[PDB]
């Protein structure tokens, strides 16, 4: 709807299958040309480049994708705890760009290459 | 506190002429138009026909309405005329805006006020 309360609400309360769209990220120039799409759902296999936060400029493999919190962990994009341990700093896919896809799954690859559908 | 910008300008123009030319009617008419709308003239043709005379411009400090019959060939000057009024008047004389009259007669001479 046009009402802000309903918009945020339908986003926070969206069922799991509707949350994939909350972890989508724009594709690199090459990939957009290759699959005829502007973006895709970031997978734990993909490689990505950070374009906005304090880690803008870095690239790395996606190590985790959390649909519950709609965020992703990217290798080496971490924070140093008090005890010294190194933990990941969650990223919104909206500040990221996919530069390499993990197509180990026929379905995803098939979905990506089809035209009537987007992956 | 008039709302109509045209009525507001007509009043200003009426004062300009009364003060510049040797007209006392225009300033007089101005004063009446400044009064509340309910006091403005609402005259039918039957009244103009009864008290007007040719070559003497009839001045109505209000609006002219179409009831009655006008035969005399007179020039009626009013703030406004109803559609029918302006039609009947033009058939045997002429209907003019108070704005034109002020221009063709800034001195405001040979004029008869009717209400």
């Amino acid at each position: 709807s046009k009402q802000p309360d309903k918009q945020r609400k339908s986003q926070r309360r969206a069922p799991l299958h509707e949350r994939h769209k909350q972890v989508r990220a724009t594709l690199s120039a090459d990939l957009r040309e290759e699959y005829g799409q502007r973006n895709v759902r970031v997978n734990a296999g993909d490689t990505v480049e950070v374009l906005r936060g304090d880690f803008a400029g870095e690239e790395g493999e996606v190590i985790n994708v959390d649909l519950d919190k709609a965020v992703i962990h990217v290798e080496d994009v971490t924070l140093e705890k008090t005890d010294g341990e190194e933990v990941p700093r969650p990223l919104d896919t909206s500040n990221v760009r996919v530069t390499d896809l993990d197509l180990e799954d026929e379905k995803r690859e098939a979905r990506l290459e089809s035209e009537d559908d987007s992956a | 506190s008039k709302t109509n910008p045209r009525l507001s300008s007509l009043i200003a123009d009426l004062k300009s002429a009364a003060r510049s030319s040797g007209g006392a009617v225009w300033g007089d008419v101005a004063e009446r138009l400044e009064k509340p709308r309910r006091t403005h003239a609402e005259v039918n043709l039957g009244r103009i026909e009864r008290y007007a005379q040719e070559d003497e411009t009839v001045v109505v400090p209000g609006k002219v309405l179409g009831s009655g019959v006008l035969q005399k060939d007179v020039t009626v000057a009013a703030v406004d005329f109803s559609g029918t009024a302006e039609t009947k008047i033009d058939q045997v004389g002429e209907a003019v805006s108070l704005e034109q009259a002020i221009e063709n007669n800034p001195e405001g001479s040979h004029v008869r006020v009717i209400r």
């Binding site: 046009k2 009402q3 802000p4 309360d5 | 709302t3 109509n4 910008p5 045209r6």
Partner: protein, 246 residues
């Protein structure tokens, strides 16, 4: 008077008689009234729950315990307007008539008057619109309706030295206040109004601040947004002629 017709390239292509209505004396008070009424007529009825604060058997103890005679329940004051959780004394009511009447003649006069304000460059410029043209409104060949791409309307407006107004409207304002909590965060200047004849211009409608309308039903509001007369308009060959009998 006469109005110059323009082709999709922006080049002059003849001219037609500007209909008499465009000579109607400009009446900003009547126009303002017409807009005021249209704006009020779309407002929704509202009001607080009629039993709000009244769902309690709270009673006053009267004199005797050194307390004010205020209805209380479980040692808590209630119901009365001065009580926290008490009823609203004179709240908004659903039964209230929030519409405004307007005689048809008076309304129609306003439309004609707003149409006429459209043919006065000085007024249009006073209203705020940006443009480097002398003749107004802008009249264009009926082929304008056949356009499809927004960008194609862009080219034409640039050719007509009128695109500057869209640049003006290409700035949204994030309003001060809580309207934002209700979906009214943004607002923006009103730019060009496109009046066609068969259907509203789908090609022009998305332009910043643009409004599209049809000659048979263009109203005081699109002709004078907010009640301010003199909107930079662009008519269609046939629109111009159709508008003549409004």
């Amino acid at each position: 008077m006469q109005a110059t017709i323009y082709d999709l390239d922006g080049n002059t292509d003849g001219e037609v008689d500007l209909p008499d209505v465009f000579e109607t004396p400009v009446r900003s008070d009547l126009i303002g009234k017409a807009v005021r009424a249209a704006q009020a007529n779309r407002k929704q009825d509202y009001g607080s729950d009629e039993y709000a604060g009244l769902r309690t058997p709270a009673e006053s103890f009267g004199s005797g315990r050194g307390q004010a005679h205020v209805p209380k329940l479980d040692g808590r004051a209630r119901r009365v307007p001065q009580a926290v959780k008490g009823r609203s004394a004179h709240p908004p009511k659903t039964e209230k008539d929030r519409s405004l009447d307007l005689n048809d003649k008076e309304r129609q006069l306003a439309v004609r008057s707003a149409l006429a304000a459209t043919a006065d460059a000085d007024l249009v410029a006073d209203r705020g619109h940006e443009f480097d043209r002398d003749e107004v409104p802008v009249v264009v060949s009926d082929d304008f309706e056949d356009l499809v791409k927004t960008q194609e309307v862009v080219s034409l407006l640039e050719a007509l030295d009128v695109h500057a107004d869209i640049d003006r409207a290409d700035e949204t304002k994030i309003k001060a206040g809580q309207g934002s909590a209700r979906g009214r965060k943004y607002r923006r200047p009103a730019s060009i109004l496109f009046v066609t004849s068969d259907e509203p211009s789908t090609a022009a409608r998305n332009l910043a601040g643009a409004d599209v309308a049809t000659a048979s039903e263009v109203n005081t509001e699109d002709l004078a947004p907010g009640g301010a007369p003199g909107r930079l308009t662009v008519f269609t060959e046939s629109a111009l002629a159709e508008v003549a009998e409004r």
